[PDB]
Amino acid sequence: GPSRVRQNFHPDSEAAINRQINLELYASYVYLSMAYYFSRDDVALNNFSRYFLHQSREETEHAEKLMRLQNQRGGRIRLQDIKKPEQDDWESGLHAMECALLLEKNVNQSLLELHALASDKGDPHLCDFLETYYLNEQVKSIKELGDHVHNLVKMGAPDAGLAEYLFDTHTLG
């Protein structure tokens, strides 16, 4: 007996949404780890910290909107463990930005695969949901991180003593 609300919602889509929820919660956790790296006494870049904390909270938002979608369409949320990030020590502001850029591209690829599945299953509601709330958000995020990586590289991060300090106070501040 399916949910009384379910219509045109393929089980494969339901499962792929559960996988995406986990990936968004994972991304939130990565950014939380980065936020607290930058508030270490031996790093102390408070605007890098604030930037990644904000990104962490945005990813939780991305997870919740997918959870809401699952309920709206009559699917059933199935949560899984949230894996720990690949590092606790993120090495530098530049390295954290590079890792965030890679993460965002990986999440983007997942979203594009989800869109292809929704298209294959003739689910225009799901296609529109991804286009409206996810795909452009990802493109903007990737572009912003690319901008930040370029400036940090050009400024001489991480080894040039003034580079991350000045980027912290003038770009992220």
Q: Which residues carry a binding-site annotation for Fe cation?
A: 24, 59, 62, 104, 138
Is there a contact between 151 and 171 (Cβ–Cβ < 8 Å)? yes
Residue 9's Cβ-side half-sphere holds a number of Cα atoms within 13 Å equal to 20
Residues of this chain, 45-64, that bind its own copies according to CB under 8 A = none
Is there a contact between 34 and 68 (Cβ–Cβ < 8 Å)? no
* Contact characters 71-110, Cl ion, x per CB under 5 A: ---------xx-----------------------------
Is there a contact between 65 and 21 (Cβ–Cβ < 8 Å)? no
12 or 44, CB closer to its own copies? 44
Nearest Cα to 134, choosing from 113, 149, 120, 157? 113
Quick check: 85 binds its own copies (CB under 8 A)?
Answer: yes
129 vs 68: CA distance, rounded Å: 12
* Contact characters 15-54, Mg ion, x per CB under 5 A: ------------------------x------x--x-----
- The angle formed by the CA atoms of residues 102, 83 and 140, to the nearest 5 degrees, is 30
Judged by CB under 5 A, which of 61, 78, 124, 162 binds Cl ion?
124
Of 31-39, 52-60, 122-130, 142-150: span binding Cl ion (CB under 5 A): 122-130
23 or 94, CB closer to Cl ion? 23
Q: Tell me the residue type at 146.
A: G
Quick check: 28 binds Fe ion (CB under 5 A)?
Answer: no
